[PDB]
Design a protein around this ligand. Structure first.
Ligand SMILES: CC(C)Cc1cc(-c2c[nH]c3ncc(-c4ccccc4)cc23)ccc1C(=O)O
Length: 288
């Protein structure tokens, strides 16, 4: 159908475009293909005036993805781009089992299953931050489970690259239920990028064990208010360890300055099973 690829069914939809299953007849491998329509992006952008154009943002995402080579992050294999054709194809390695969870759910993960996946998430995010990338859309439906049972981070549509020790950001992107209070607040005009990913990791972990979001409303403007102003409250069931409760509370600290950072999360008693399952060092995980 397309070069050496046989296109198959649509399997997911991220922030942009459609992901479909494809089969490469030359290497007998299945791939996931993100398909973008250039005219669609331009039409939908409309009269919007922005520093960066819609097609330009796509190229920035491609550049980000080309940097990444880690077992807990998706792998971009190829880009098929013809200036004459409307569609652009981003070919990724397939992660066979799909999203770890869709929220809400009546069947959440056990505490042990959540720890296993949360460890993968920590390693993948430590790597992204090491590579100077803020994901900005961490949520359970963007965490794909491989055939080997491990998580890979996907959907870099709203991600950005930063030059310094941290990213200094002023705009609000991603999924509303996972957005940090700082990003939504008019008082906080700029905010740390790393702390946004940690907040979203916190919402994600709460989702893992409870099958529901900490903050939710049908009206998005109310949801923003609850994120900023509603106290974190845990459900009665399942009854989780105080251990885990403490970690989630610190990740969902509404003040980004006192919020727990990734190097502290790595050593948290819940994550490590009190030192039984320690994570590798930053260098071992990122440049090894
Ligand atoms: C929400 C998600 C679709 C976002 C996404 C996923 C992938 C992707 C890479 N390798 C994959 N292997 C499996 C699946 C999958 C399988 C079953 C069900 C759903 C997804 C997806 C991928 C690439 C780009 C994007 C994006 O939009 O930027």
């Amino acid at each position: 159908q397309l070069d050496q690829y046989t296109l198959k069914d649509e399997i997911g939809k991220g922030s942009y475009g459609v992901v479909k299953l494809a089969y490469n007849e030359n290497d007998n491998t299945y791939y996931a293909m993100k398909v973008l329509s250039k005219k669609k992006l331009i039409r939908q952008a409309g009269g919007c005036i922005q520093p960066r154009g819609p097609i330009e943002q796509v190229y920035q995402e491609i550049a980000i993805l080309k940097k990444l080579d880690h077992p807990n992050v998706v792998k971009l294999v190829e880009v098929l781009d013809d200036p004459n054709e409307d569609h652009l194809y981003m070919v990724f390695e397939l992660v066979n089992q799909g999203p770890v969870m869709e929220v809400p759910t009546l069947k959440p993960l056990s505490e042990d299953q959540a720890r296993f996946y949360f460890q993968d998430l920590i390693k993948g995010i430590e790597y992204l931050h090491y590579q100077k990338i803020i994901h900005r859309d961490i949520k359970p439906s963007n965490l794909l489970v491989g055939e080997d049972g491990h998580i890979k981070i996907a959907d870099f549509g709203v991600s950005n690259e930063f030059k310094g020790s941290d990213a200094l950001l002023s705009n609000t992107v991603g999924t509303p239920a996972f957005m940090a209070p700082e990003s939504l607040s008019e008082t906080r005009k700029i905010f740390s990028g790393k702390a946004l990913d940690v907040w979203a990791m916190g919402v994600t972990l709460y989702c893992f064990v409870f099958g529901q979001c900490p903050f939710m409303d049908e009206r998005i403007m109310c949801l923003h208010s609850k994120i900023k102003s509603q106290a974190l409250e845990f459900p009665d069931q399942p009854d989780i360890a105080e251990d885990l409760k403490d970690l989630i509370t610190r990740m969902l600290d509404k003040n980004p300055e006192s919020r727990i950072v990734v190097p502290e999360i790595k050593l948290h008693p819940w994550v490590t099973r009190h030192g039984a399952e320690p994570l590798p060092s930053e260098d071992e995980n990122c440049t090894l």
